Design a binder for this molecule. Structure first.
Ligand SMILES: Nc1ncnc2c1ncn2[C@@H]1O[C@H](COP(=O)(O)OP(=O)(O)O)[C@@H](O)[C@H]1O
Ligand SMILES: Nc1ncnc2c1ncn2[C@@H]1O[C@H](COP(=O)(O)OP(=O)(O)O)[C@@H](O)[C@H]1O
Ligand SMILES: [Mg+2]
Ligand SMILES: [Mg+2]
Lengths: 7, 735, 372, 139
């Protein structure tokens, strides 16, 4: 992703 | 515009459409006084006018001067009842009216009389069309189609029977024997009984007569198109599936069939469904005795015959076979179910293998294969698809074993072909089967109209007249509505895919696309369920109920593979041996078969024979004005006549014109100058080079003003001869 | 005619075929291979990258990256390779000839839409395109119009209640639990029996263990006690080099993590709870239909017994008045693509496409406005 | 009409009086007009007679003085030829066709009158020179 997770 | 005192008119009546009236007063401009019993008549923004006896008899609906439904119907009535005479021409078209009694008019001396003759020279008779075909093939090497059309009573079979008897009897001459022997078979598999009447060829039927390079029959080749598969599975009330199933059922008592355990037609689900187990026409065993004779004579051996009856007994047994359902997604056959076991005993296959593949369908992508349970409804629809696919392959096989017996030893130089197809139709419940019939008819009327417009532009060319305002109605915008993307068939087949689909939701899509966007499509105010199509003949209304169950065909390839495995007899595995076709749905298969038909037709120049039931309840050789108007509108006759009346309908040869009248050198200008004295406007008629071309009224206008001048000469002679002679008589008395 | 391309981006697999096919012709992992070593021999084939089944064949020699993690495309240059390989090599079909249909998870970062579109129009010059929410397609595949769809892939788990053609977007729930993170947990717990998998390529050995051996416990704790009491649940599997490994009560413990994600340390409850809790977000009037129409979709659901466990646990949590029914098509891993085939073949759908002209005017923002 | 004409007409009228009352019948009025050089049609005769009904035409009697205004009113070749050329251009007319049209159309005459006038006028084919017959009947 961009925040709460690695992607 | 004119009415004299005692100028007769046709006026409408509901009971019987047209009645004459004596016009007892000169009309001037809203109520009018007329006698049949005398009643005034009232107008809004006008009665049509009645041809004099000089015209009324005539062979030729174009020659009539007042062109309208009353005049046409009156001629056909007097020509049918009062004159015992069978045929008429309208434009390029012959029109045929069922005499329903067997007549001297068909005979070999008269066949020979018609030979080497051209349609104008001698009376309308079916032979004249076959002559124009033959002579065209002699003139210009194109292959001739002859087209026979109309409601199921009209005798399209017996007309084609004569049209073939003609070619064979002239040619030099064994074709007739085989071709006429074949019809008991092709009707027995291909004819059906309906609420209206009880022989109806649902498939579309084509014979090619092949010819030698010197012209004789080499032989014949049959084809078929548009087979209405759905009647096998599903039937309306008072209606039956193809006769052969009932022939089997009546035979079942006989010892040979005994293995097949065939019961009564009411007992089997497919024959049960129409509620019409027994019929006036035949004890069906008697018909099959002639079906079997025709097979044996046409070279289908008993070994094949018993195979065919084995297959049909299979198809009748399959209907009996009925699923418990475990679960929404699941169907089961009960642990013994008798008809499936008997069906397997007929065709030599494992009970377990059908039982599994009937319930489940296979899916595979190369990594893995999967087997799904499916609902009871998909199990039904797949069983019905299998029954249809089997039937339609048995049919496409029998048509080849007939053709094997039928073909010539040798290559045809060219052929002439004779085609029997059901006409445009209306019923008082209308169903996808009728939407198919009407669609095929409209797509043929497109070719009819094109051939009309072309032959008229030729006839205007070869003798010159200005060529604009040569006109025809165009049906193509309705065809586009049916055929195009988001057309009525296209949404039907789409909703066959869509996850839960129903007649109601299909109609709701039809309304949302067409309802007030497409001029030819309409809704009946009182119903959501139906819709109205503005066909070329008429507006027609179709009930959407049970389209989709008829529309939907797909066959699980496993189920057919199980049959294609069978050892037990040659025929069953043979049929299929010949996928995407299994994907395809009765509407799309009909569309394609209809394209194959119109390609085989358009390669060929037409000739047209149009055939009406004159009668209802089979009373011989009497006539009903109610039926014939419906029939004739359904044949595009009234279209053609309306279109002609607008323009330059009538033709007069100057030679006949002067032989008819001397009432006022060189003949062409003599007749011109006479007509200029008689007529006041060049726009109102035209001069061809052999012909003269009159606008519709002008022939009757001339006939009346001529008859009036002749009457004035009559009265002057009668007066002067009475003056001289009756005076002489009383003076001789004076002596 | 022209018949649409239908192409599905998972995280673990790519599936593609033509509309109206019964099942995709190409399936291969969306995995990109790079060497780790010096090339020894001059004259060898010197390849700069491998894609999919090539990278499967050579995985020992290679680094296996995934372009997609949690349904998000993480590096667009290798994604371009994935698509290019799909169209030219697997399908043998130029994209300029055919429109394409592309598949996405429902809450993924909005930019993923623009970029995925831009690559189709600029790079491949596709005639036209559309993008579909997986759960919607699962309903087309199963053949119904009211469903709560649960789907779980390599990348994402989500729920989308759909009532009679209407999706109900506020209900939507998503968990990042997936076939990949069951795999990493499978490595961690396999370590306890002494079998230790470090490299990228080893993960796929683990994943084959997981696919073959695993199953879902119907009572987790009673089977734990049984397997501690008795060996019979233990089962054994062969490493690529031929060493056997033998695996016990632990083989179910990975499927259990979906129900008890506290093992890995998630906040969010197991999929059973989120399923019920998503039904609770809906109106009461619909709920009777959704309790029957539970649809499972995507390959993670394939664990034997996941249906019976789900039904059992949700029944206890449901209001007793309502029956619970669960529907699990045996191919359901494909079902997202089967649905995208049905939907792409419909005539009514045709006007839905984003056409090249329309994109060219609108700019890739158009995807948000038209497509959803 | 002058006195001489009135005298000739009165004498002729009295020749037609078959009852002695100095009167003729309405039905004789036309005959007297034709005998006196007029060629009125039956319609014209009935019009000057007032379109009488059968009963008064056959039995109502009028004297010369009342008849005279009607004769006056009635009094106040190429068409005949074209009319005969209707029934022909070699100058002949079928006897059957002339008989049929004269006895069945228009103001139908009797077969005996036509036979009488046609006697000696038809040739061996049964054809009548109509130009000669017309000149004969108009004299
Ligand atoms: N021209 C005709 N001469 C004799 N009988 C005729 C003629 N036209 C029709 N019929 C009668 O009507 C039927 C015509 O053939 P049929 O096959 O029943 O009609 P269709 O070919 O329209 O289905 C037969 O019963 C036949 O006796
Ligand atoms: N038979 C099986 N049993 C258990 N898990 C499986 C099976 N087949 C595939 N999987 C798992 O499914 C996941 C891939 O699911 P998939 O639907 O292909 O994801 P996506 O299509 O979104 O990439 C992988 O974790 C794989 O290990
Ligand atoms: Mg017939
Ligand atoms: Mg998925």
């Amino acid at each position: 992703w961009x925040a709460x997770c690695p992607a | 515009e004119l009415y004299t005192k005692y100028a007769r008119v046709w006026i409408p009546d509901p009971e019987e459409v047209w009645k004459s009236a004596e016009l007892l007063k000169d009309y001037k401009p809203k109520v009018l006084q007329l006698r049949l019993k005398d009643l005034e008549y009232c107008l809004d923004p006008l009665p049509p006018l009645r041809n004099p006896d000089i015209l009324v008899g005539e062979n030729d609906l174009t020659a009539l001067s007042y062109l309208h439904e009353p005049a046409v119907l009156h001629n056909l009535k007097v020509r049918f009842i009062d004159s015992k005479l069978i045929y008429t021409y309208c434009g390029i078209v012959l029109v045929a009216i069922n005499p329903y009694e067997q007549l001297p008019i068909y005979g070999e001396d008269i066949i020979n009389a018609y030979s080497g003759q051209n349609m104008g020279d001698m009376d309308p008779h079916i032979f004249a069309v076959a002559e124009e075909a033959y002579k065209q093939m002699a003139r210009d090497e194109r292959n001739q189609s002859i087209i026979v059309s109309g409601e199921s009573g009209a005798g399209k079979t017996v007309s084609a029977k004569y049209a073939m008897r003609y070619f064979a009897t002239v040619s030099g001459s064994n074709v007739e024997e085989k071709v006429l022997a074949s019809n008991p078979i092709m009707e027995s598999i291909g004819n059906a009984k309906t609420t209206r009447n009880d022989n109806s060829s649902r498939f579309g039927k084509y014979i090619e007569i092949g010819f030698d390079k010197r012209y004789r029959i080499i032989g014949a080749n049959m084809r078929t198109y548009l087979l209405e598969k759905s009647r096998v599975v599903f039937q309306a009330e008072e209606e039956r599936n193809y006769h052969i199933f009932y022939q089997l059922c009546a035979s079942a008592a006989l010892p040979e069939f005994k293995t097949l355990r065939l019961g009564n037609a009411n007992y089997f689900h497919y024959t049960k469904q129409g509620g019409s187990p027994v019929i006036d026409g035949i004890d069906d065993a008697k018909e099959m005795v002639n079906t079997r004779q025709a097979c044996t004579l046409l070279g289908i051996s008993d070994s094949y015959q018993m195979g065919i009856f084995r297959i049909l007994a299979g198809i009748l047994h399959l209907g009996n076979v009925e699923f418990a359902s475990r679960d929404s997604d699941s169907c089961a056959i009960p642990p013994k179910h008798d008809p499936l076991t008997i069906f397997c005993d007929l065709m030599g296959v494992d009970y377990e293998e059908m039982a599994h593949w009937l319930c489940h369908r296979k899916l595979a992508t190369a990594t893995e294969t999967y087997i799904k349970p499916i609902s009871k409804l998909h199990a039904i629809n797949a069983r019905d698809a299998l029954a249809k696919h089997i039937y339609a392959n048995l049919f496409n096989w029998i048509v080849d074993h007939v053709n094997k017996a039928l073909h010539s030893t040798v290559k045809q130089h060219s052929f002439i072909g004779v085609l029997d197809i059901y006409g445009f139709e209306t019923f008082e419940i209308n169903s996808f089967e009728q939407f198919c019939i009407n669609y095929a008819n409209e797509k043929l009327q497109q070719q009819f109209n094109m051939h009309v417009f072309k032959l008229e532009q030729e006839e205007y060319m070869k003798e010159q007249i200005p060529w604009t305002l040569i006109d025809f109605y165009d049906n193509q915008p309705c065809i586009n509505l049916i055929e195009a993307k988001m057309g009525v068939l296209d949404l039907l087949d789409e909703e066959c895919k869509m996850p839960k689909g129903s007649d109601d939701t299909w109609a709701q899509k039809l309304y949302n696309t067409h309802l007030n966007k497409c001029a030819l499509f309409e809704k009946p105010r009182l119903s959501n369920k139906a819709f109205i199509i503005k066909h070329f003949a008429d507006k027609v209304e179709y009930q959407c109920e049970g389209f989709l169950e008829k529309n939907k065909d797909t066959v699980y390839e496993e189920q057919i593979k199980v049959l294609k495995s069978s050892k037990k007899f040659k025929l069953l595995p043979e049929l299929f041996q010949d996928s995407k076709e299994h994907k395809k749905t009765v509407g799309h298969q009909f569309r394609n078969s209809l394209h194959l038909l119109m390609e085989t037709l358009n390669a060929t120049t037409p000739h047209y024979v149009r055939c009406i039931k004159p009668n209802d309840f089979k009373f011989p050789f009497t006539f009903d004005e109610k039926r014939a108007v419906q029939q004739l509108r359904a044949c595009g006759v009234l279209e053609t006549i309306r279109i002609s009346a607008a323009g330059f309908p009538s033709r007069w040869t100057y030679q006949e014109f002067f032989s008819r009248y001397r009432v006022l050198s060189d003949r062409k200008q003599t007749c011109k100058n006479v007509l200029e004295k008689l007529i006041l406007d060049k726009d109102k008629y035209q001069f061809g080079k052999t012909k003269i071309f009159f606008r519709a009224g002008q022939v009757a206008y001339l006939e009346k003003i001529r008859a009036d001048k002749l009457r004035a000469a009559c009265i002057r002679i009668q007066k002067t001869i009475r003056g001289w002679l009756m005076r002489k008589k009383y003076m001789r008395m004076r002596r | 005619e022209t018949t649409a391309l239908v192409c599905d981006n998972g995280s673990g697999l790519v599936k593609a075929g033509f509309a109206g096919d019964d099942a995709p012709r190409a399936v291969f992992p969306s995995i990109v291979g790079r060497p780790r070593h010096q090339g020894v021999m001059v004259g060898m084939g010197q390849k700069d990258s491998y894609v999919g089944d090539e990278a499967q064949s050579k995985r020992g020699i290679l680094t296996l990256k995934y372009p997609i993690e949690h349904g998000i495309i993480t590096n667009w240059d290798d994604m371009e390779k994935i698509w290019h390989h799909t169209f030219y090599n697997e399908l043998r079909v130029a994209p300029e000839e055919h429109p394409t249909l592309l598949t996405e998870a429902p809450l993924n970062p909005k930019a993923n839409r623009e970029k995925m579109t831009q690559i189709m129009f600029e790079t491949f010059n596709v005639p036209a395109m559309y993008v579909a929410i997986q759960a919607v397609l699962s309903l087309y595949a199963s053949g119904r119009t009211t469903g709560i769809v649960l789907d779980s892939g390599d990348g994402v788990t989500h729920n989308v209640p759909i009532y009679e053609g209407y999706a109900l977007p506020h209900a939507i729930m998503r968990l990042d639990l997936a076939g990949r993170d069951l795999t990493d947990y499978l490595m961690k717990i396999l370590t306890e029996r002494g079998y230790s998998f470090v490299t990228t390529a080893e993960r796929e050995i683990v994943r084959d263990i997981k696919e073959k051996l695993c199953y879902v416990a119907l009572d987790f704790e009673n089977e734990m006690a049984t397997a501690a009491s008795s060996s019979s649940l233990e089962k054994s599997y062969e490493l690529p080099d031929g060493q056997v490994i033998t695996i016990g009560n632990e083989r179910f413990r990975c499927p259990e993590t979906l129900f008890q994600p506290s093992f890995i340390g998630m906040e969010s409850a197991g999929i059973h709870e989120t399923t019920y809790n998503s039904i609770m977000k809906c109106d009461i009037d619909i709920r009777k239909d959704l309790y029957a129409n539970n649809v499972m979709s995507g390959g993670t659901t394939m664990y034997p017994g996941i249906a019976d466990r789900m039904q059992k646990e949700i029944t206890a949590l449901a209001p007793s008045t309502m029956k619970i029914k669960i529907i699990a098509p045996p191919e359901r891993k494909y079902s997202v693509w089967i649905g995208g085939s049905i939907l792409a073949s419909l005539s009514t759908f045709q006007q839905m496409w984003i056409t090249k002209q329309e994109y060219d005017e609108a700019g890739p923002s158009i995807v948000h406005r038209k497509c959803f | 009409f002058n006195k001489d004409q009135l005298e000739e007409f009165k004498e002729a009228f009295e020749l037609f009086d078959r009852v002695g009352d100095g009167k003729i019948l309405y039905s004789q009025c036309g005959d007297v007009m034709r005998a006196l050089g007029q060629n009125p049609t039956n319609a014209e005769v009935l019009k000057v007679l007032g379109n009488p009904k059968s009963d008064e035409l056959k039995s109502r009697r009028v004297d010369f003085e009342t008849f005279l205004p009607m004769l006056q009113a009635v009094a106040k070749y190429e068409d005949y030829l074209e009319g005969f050329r209707v029934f022909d251009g070699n100058g002949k007319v079928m006897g059957a066709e002339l008989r049929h049209v004269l006895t069945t159309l228009g103001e139908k005459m009797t077969e005996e009158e036509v036979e009488t006038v046609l006697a000696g006028h038809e040739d061996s084919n049964g054809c009548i020179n109509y130009e000669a017959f017309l000149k004969h009947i108009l004299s």
